[PDB]
Design a protein around this ligand. Sequence first.
Ligand SMILES: *[C@@H]1O[C@H](CO)[C@@H](O[C@@H]2O[C@H](CO)[C@@H](O)[C@H](O)[C@H]2NC(C)=O)[C@H](O)[C@H]1NC(C)=O
Ligand SMILES: *[C@@H]1O[C@H](CO)[C@@H](O)[C@H](O)[C@H]1NC(C)=O
Length: 534
Amino acid sequence: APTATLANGDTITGLNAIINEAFLGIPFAEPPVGNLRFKDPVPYSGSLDGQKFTSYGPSCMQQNPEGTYEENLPKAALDLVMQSKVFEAVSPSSEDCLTINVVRPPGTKAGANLPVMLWIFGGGFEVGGTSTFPPAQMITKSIAMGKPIIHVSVNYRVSSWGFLAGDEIKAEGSANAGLKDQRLGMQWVADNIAAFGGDPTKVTIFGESAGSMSVMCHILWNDGDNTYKGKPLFRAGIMQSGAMVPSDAVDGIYGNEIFDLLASNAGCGSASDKLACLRGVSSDTLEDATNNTPGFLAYSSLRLSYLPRPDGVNITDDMYALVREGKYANIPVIIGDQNDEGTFFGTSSLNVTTDAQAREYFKQSFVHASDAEIDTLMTAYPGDITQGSPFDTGILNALTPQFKRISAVLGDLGFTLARRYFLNHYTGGTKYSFLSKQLSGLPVLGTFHSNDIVFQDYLLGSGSLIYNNAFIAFATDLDPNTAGLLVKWPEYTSSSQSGNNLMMINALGLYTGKDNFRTAGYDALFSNPPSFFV
Ligand SMILES: *[C@@H]1O[C@H](CO)[C@@H](O[C@@H]2O[C@H](CO)[C@@H](O)[C@H](O)[C@H]2NC(C)=O)[C@H](O)[C@H]1NC(C)=O
Ligand SMILES: *[C@@H]1O[C@H](CO)[C@@H](O)[C@H](O)[C@H]1NC(C)=O
């Protein structure tokens, strides 16, 4: 009953979900199956005329987050759940999964020229789908604000399906397939969103966690040339927990190792052309083989098996060097963090209890760091339990002697201080930054990684003022301060600036503060960023 006539003249029918109009599961690419596996997405060349798009299609195949080549109860348990027919029913996944979803205010028509917020989900570049991030809460708040927006979300390939690396991938020019799927969805939005009522010149890309790192990679893509047919694909970005990816090149040592392990697992260890061997195995075999390489909750934790890597062609270099060197799109950005980003990931190494074990675990994680750098890291993130994450909880939360320390390190390198490095080097547009302390006092996890999805899409809280209202204002006016919040959000210029530069959130509301914490950790980590790449 919602209808839209797309650029090629196909007329499709969506769903009227009374508080909004949805067009769900629209195919934007040919199915990346068989020989199209691990390859760049191909535009969808087919007809959609007269079809209805009233539900989410399957997610892309998902890796077991406890997957590993070792056998253990968490791995076993999550497989039990993931291959259950009830799980398959409620959460279908498929290699044919590249669909896009357009949801809008009731009554929107072609030509309305509403701002578009394009959502990139994140799941440690190994799980995730669009269906789990309901847009209703954002759309309703935008209407009530007088600033209505269209919400678009795009599926992309995750895990081995989407981020296989190594020498053979590099040689074929197929690196970072998953980010290419997101780039092709952006191109579809530029070409088709006006038929839904959206303005192709007012697209804000936003994402959380691996989706946020994805937004960063899109700012850096093609050395910052973000145009399509002579026009920018997005005029702004919002990054919720995640900035540059600390990754070695695609044909680096861990990219190749994971490739060879995967290919032994699928039965391709003796293939002359492993890559062609992996295109021939079944979906079950490939799923199996992937669950036998480490998932992001396994012991390897942030030394991820599948993640964006510089390839020298679309991400031309080390992502930290691209930012020092100015190779980025010049846009206004919001980038923020949850106060205790690493507590989640610290749960993967709870068998590390002594300093000697903590030193070995960092050495295993960071193969390029010298002993002097490991020594500096362990001085800057001391074993003292009052010092680590959950921050400012004293002697509480001491699951081990090292949990709070490993959690402080991992949340900082992967997200919180990575964000400060970007902010201190980026001159492309106005910057805004937030830090949430909304769930201070939550045992074990603190203001944990991803709690912002709850207050953006599910429940209302003091944080929703930022994750919905300030973000809607930014997507409409390019300034979060048009939301008329009582605290003014100051512009971030530098971490050494005078005066408050961070919007902050606690259980009661908003206030501002300074991005001047853990400076010793920032230099331990980022004096020579490649020392801590994976
Ligand atoms: C904590 O557990 C991890 C995961 O089992 C241990 O690392 C594994 O150890 C086995 C046996 O030595 C190796 O075969 C695996 O290859 C290791 N896995 C990984 C991902 O490295 C680790 O030894 C334990 N750590 C401590 C401090 O005891
Ligand atoms: C990747 O880089 C090459 C070389 O600049 C370019 O031709 C190609 O269009 C890029 N791919 C995407 C999706 O931007």
